[PDB]
Structure 1
Amino acid sequence: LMPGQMPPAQPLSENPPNHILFLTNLPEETNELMLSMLFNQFPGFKEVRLVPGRHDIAFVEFDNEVQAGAARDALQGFKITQNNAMKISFAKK
């Protein structure tokens, strides 16, 4: 049988994964309202997390701690604008 709600795997490098993804290469005008829409349209969404002093990086949670890893491969390099492509990766707790 399946392992059920199996925990997320590590990214392309050694790192402790968690219920949230690290976004990268975001536009210079990003905000929680826009970031929320581009994740709320997915088959799973819970919350979003921003960091001050930044605009090219952010954090986002999917339906649950498991399914954020699914959105990683699903949103890899979101062409939010002509100069910025949202990279998706596992954040660190």
Structure 2
Amino acid sequence: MAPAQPLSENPPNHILFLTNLPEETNELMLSMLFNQFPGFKEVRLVPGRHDIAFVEFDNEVQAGAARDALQGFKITQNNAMKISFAKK
């Protein structure tokens, strides 16, 4: 219940890897959505999958900007997309 401990240290992180974002979605799509951000560094969305997104954004302000921009991509209409920072 909200402990006063130094829990987590990397956050906010600038690498968001996860899936749950398919539906003819693609690499130039996610590359332009990720492109929106000057942080546009790594974009991995392309196998038969078209549903596993690996986004490396120069910095977390821009990774956080992209993530906060599409922070609830209702694929949930079947599934709410899942993007998980490279928390380590």
Task: Give TM-score, length-normalised by structure 2.
Answer: 0.55
Per mean C-alpha deviation after superposition, the further-off stretch among 46-55 and 80-89 is: 80-89
Q: Where does 1:61-72 land on structure 2 (aligned, <5 Å)?
A: 61-64=56-59, 67-69=62-64, 71-72=66-67
Query: C-alpha distance in 2, partners of 1:39/1:11?
Result: 31
Q: Which has the higher helix share?
A: 2
Is 1:24–1:86's contact at 8 Å kept on the other side of the alignment?
yes
Q: Secondary structure at the match of 1:66?
A: helix
Aligned residue number for residue 77 of structure 2? 82
Identity %: 99
Per mean C-alpha deviation after superposition, the further-off stretch among 19-28 and 79-88 is: 79-88
Per mean C-alpha deviation after superposition, the further-off stretch among 10-19 and 37-46 is: 10-19
Is 2:44–2:52's contact at 8 Å kept on the other side of the alignment?
no
Is 2:33–2:66's contact at 8 Å kept on the other side of the alignment?
no
Is 1:8–1:17's contact at 8 Å kept on the other side of the alignment?
no
Task: Give TM-score, length-normalised by structure 1.
Answer: 0.53
Q: Secondary structure at the match of 1:84?
A: coil
- Aligned pair partner of 2:3 in 4, 8, 27: 8
Is 1:26–1:55's contact at 8 Å kept on the other side of the alignment?
yes
Is 1:27–1:83's contact at 8 Å kept on the other side of the alignment?
no
Runs of at least 5 residues in structure 1 that lack an aligned partner in the other structure: 1-5
| Cα drift, residue 10 of structure 1 | 14
Per mean C-alpha deviation after superposition, the further-off stretch among 76-85 and 10-19 is: 10-19
Per mean C-alpha deviation after superposition, the further-off stretch among 49-58 and 64-73 is: 64-73
Larger radius of gyration: 2
1:26-82 CA-partner distances (Å, limit 9, x unpaired) = 123122111111111135322312363523222111124775355444432234795
Query: C-alpha distance in 2, partners of 1:38/1:10?
Result: 36
